[PDB]
Design a binder for these strands. Structure first.
Ligand code: BEF
Lengths: 102, 97, 119, 79, 67, 75, 66
DNA sequence: GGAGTAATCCCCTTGGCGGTTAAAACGCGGGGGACAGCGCGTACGTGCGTTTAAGCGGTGCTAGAGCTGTCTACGACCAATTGAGCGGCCTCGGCACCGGGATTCTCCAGGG
DNA sequence: CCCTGGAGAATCCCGGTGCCGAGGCCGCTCAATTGGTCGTAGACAGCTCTAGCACCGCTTAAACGCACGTACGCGCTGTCCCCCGCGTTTTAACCGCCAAGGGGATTACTCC
């Protein structure tokens, strides 16, 4: 493959063309054009582990968007990154106030 | 007539409505409101297929977050349920304009 | 329809999805999530359109027992007449001109009746 | 060929409150939240029509909703 | 056409051999991964223009500040 | 200017920031801007909690008034 | 901040009736916001190929989030 | 012998209905939510007798700062070859909400 | 009156058992190699230098009590309101069903 230089496996060719021509830096001079794919592999692996754990539980084997919404709201680093996003095909965090409650 | 105390049966309503992926918004007229909004000024949209679901879920996010902020401001006051003044508190502090 | 799509996927909350030509055509992606034991159509003379997207919807339906309920198969245009068999089970070869068409139609209609007789 | 709203439910607005953490109700729960909906949506579409009338151009594929709502103040994921 | 899915399942086999996931999760993966890519590219664009030094440290600073 | 005098806030800033990096230093600038921004945030929170107290039927704001002022202003 | 500065703040202070409450509250997030802004400044000035904080490398410190 | 006129395909709309369920609302009971005035006191109110510090201004250079020769250290063209995962498919493991079975959730009128 | 015998309701442990389901597997193909070319970002040596910090030497600006002293925080208490509970009913989007012309493309037929 063209990605196994440092444990990566995502496609490189089109990614090499895009990162080299990212239109944001004049030249990536020594230089980590593959670090975008590195963080991409990192996120893919963490999503793999989380989704496997979620699907394997609930006595099922599939990921319902409810589970992914719960996982997205679960993390704190993702909340600090972009905390102004919501997940569709699910529901809001359940809530009842003790003052609302009888 | 097994009529029990309201608030606890409202509590079981909350429990049922806050458990699964159920679409609590009986809201194709929400889609018609979106259509009236979109065709209010322009025309010939020619959009995607499931985009209505995404925009409606964004509407749900905004409105429901407003709901929880309003309930927090309401229990902040001496009134548990949703009050318009609590919603004004929840929206003005957000920088509504 | 999503308000009754919550407790709807698996159980016999519907013993049968009476899914007309309405929901099959436009939601072939959504109709690729749950098992379906049976597959039928009504008066399939008007569904002669083999190149319709409903064909793509119902082709991927890996059903153990298909079926077809046609009001009246036509008398000419052998292609739409074998379209019933093709919808029933896509197992026959695409070519059908070997039976008739180019090489006196009494034998042709007799062969049509014969190849229909079991089905 | 235009259609308009009728009031936004007793029941569905009630479930909106239910997932908002509300069991009973006041007289200021159903209607006004929809008014906030209308005000926020009219503001975001005001910005959108300003954008599309300053240059007089159409829009692009479904990726617009996530970016426009993020600038608005409440965006979405799901696809 | 091009699918990251095969590489994703390779990483899964590195982690878990026989687990199945859903397509909606794959679409959300596409969306969030690509918007992370856009944000990380946007963050490390003119940092090399902050001072007259215009690499790897740009994206390193990007991940340092976004996280 | 600096209602809280420049030297107290300078001492606090230096004491707090000494732990990040050794031998950290500032130029002639970046002295009075931090307190000005902090006071701007404080005044915005004051306006928000004053509005909340106006709603709360009591001029006296409280812990929860300021909590609502800070939380719903954006963060 | 000390008692007289908070006293003037409470003099503004919604007819002064909010004095004690703001006296107790406004000092809680002072250090938190100060730490946040100085940490952001440190992160911005990390990539400056210099040895001290300069205004050159902190112009676009919060360009990501405004 | 490729284009000019025009006969062909055709499919896609401009629009109006079968079939259709949810969408908003009624509707009655009441009891919990609606919103506040007082009790009084505690919760703040406040203005002048009593000081460290703050924001400095009197030399000499004094940690970081901008500084111009002339380059050391590198990152992007083309040309014949070729391997990664894509171009298309759907295989064997494990699915997927109300039933077999009903104790939970919630109130109420007599035991007490 | 407490405590409770008895009344109402409702979906959690694992399937319905036939198919969802993710990207292995057929290998090929299109931008990566290495065959040479090529001049630009980063920078080492270089020189005092910006404003004022070490002394001295500051003048009051906040910063601290007192002596009472004078009103409102949260819930009692009050009506009061009041709108869901969840069954029931009527406004209410979407998606095939219809039979046609426009017209872009596209070649039958042809022609200068
Ligand atoms: F089903 Be029919 F009327 F042929």
């Amino acid at each position: 493959s063209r990605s196994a230089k440092a444990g990566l496996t995502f496609p490189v060719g089109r990614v090499h063309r895009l990162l080299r021509r990212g239109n944001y830096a004049q030249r990536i001079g020594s230089g980590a054009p593959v670090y975008l794919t590195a963080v991409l592999e990192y996120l893919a692996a963490e999503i793999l582990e989380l989704a496997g754990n979620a699907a394997r539980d609930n006595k099922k084997t599939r990921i319902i968007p409810r589970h992914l919404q719960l996982a997205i709201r679960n993390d704190d680093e993702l909340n600090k990154l972009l905390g102004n996003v919501t997940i569709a095909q699910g529901g809001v965090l359940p809530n009842i106030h003790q003052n609302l409650l009888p | 007539p097994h009529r029990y105390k309201p608030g606890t049966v409202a509590l079981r309503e909350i429990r049922r409505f806050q458990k699964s992926t159920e679409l609590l918004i009986r809201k194709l007229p929400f889609q018609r409101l979106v259509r009236e909004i979109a065709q209010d000024f322009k025309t010939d949209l020619r959009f995607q297929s499931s985009a209505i679901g995404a925009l409606q879920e964004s509407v749900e996010a905004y409105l429901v977050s407003l709901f929880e902020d309003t309930n927090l401001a309401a229990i902040h006051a001496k009134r548990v349920t949703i009050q318009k003044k609590e919603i004004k508190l929840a929206r003005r502090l957000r920088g509504e304009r | 329809r999503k308000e009754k799509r919550k407790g709807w996927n698996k159980p016999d909350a519907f013993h049968v999805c009476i899914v007309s030509y309405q929901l099959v055509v436009q939601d072939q992606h959504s109709f690729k999530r749950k098992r379906w034991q049976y597959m039928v159509l009504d008066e399939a003379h008007n569904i002669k359109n083999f190149r319709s997207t409903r064909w793509q919807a119902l082709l991927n339906f890996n059903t153990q027992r298909r079926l077809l309920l046609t009001g009246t198969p036509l008398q000419n245009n052998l292609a739409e007449l074998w379209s019933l068999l093709y919808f029933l089970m896509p197992q026959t070869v695409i070519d059908g001109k070997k039976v008739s068409g180019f090489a006196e139609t009494k034998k042709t209609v007799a062969k049509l009746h014969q190849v229909l007789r079991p089905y | 060929l235009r259609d308009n709203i009728q009031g936004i439910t007793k029941p569905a607005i009630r479930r909106l409150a239910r997932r908002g953490g509300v069991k009973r109700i006041s007289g200021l729960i159903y209607e006004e939240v929809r008014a906030v909906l209308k005000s926020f949506l009219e503001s975001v579409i005001r910005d959108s029509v300003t954008y599309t009338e300053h240059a007089k151009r159409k829009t692009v594929t479904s990726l617009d909703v996530v970016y426009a709502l993020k600038r608005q103040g409440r965006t979405l994921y799901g696809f | 056409k091009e699918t990251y899915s095969s590489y994703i399942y390779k990483v899964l086999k590195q982690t878990h051999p026989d687990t199945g996931i859903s397509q909606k999760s794959m679409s959300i993966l596409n969306s969030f991964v690509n918007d992370i890519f856009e944000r990380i590219a946007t963050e490390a664009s003119k940092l090399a223009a902050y001072n007259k030094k215009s690499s790897a440290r740009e994206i390193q600073t990007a991940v340092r500040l976004i996280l």
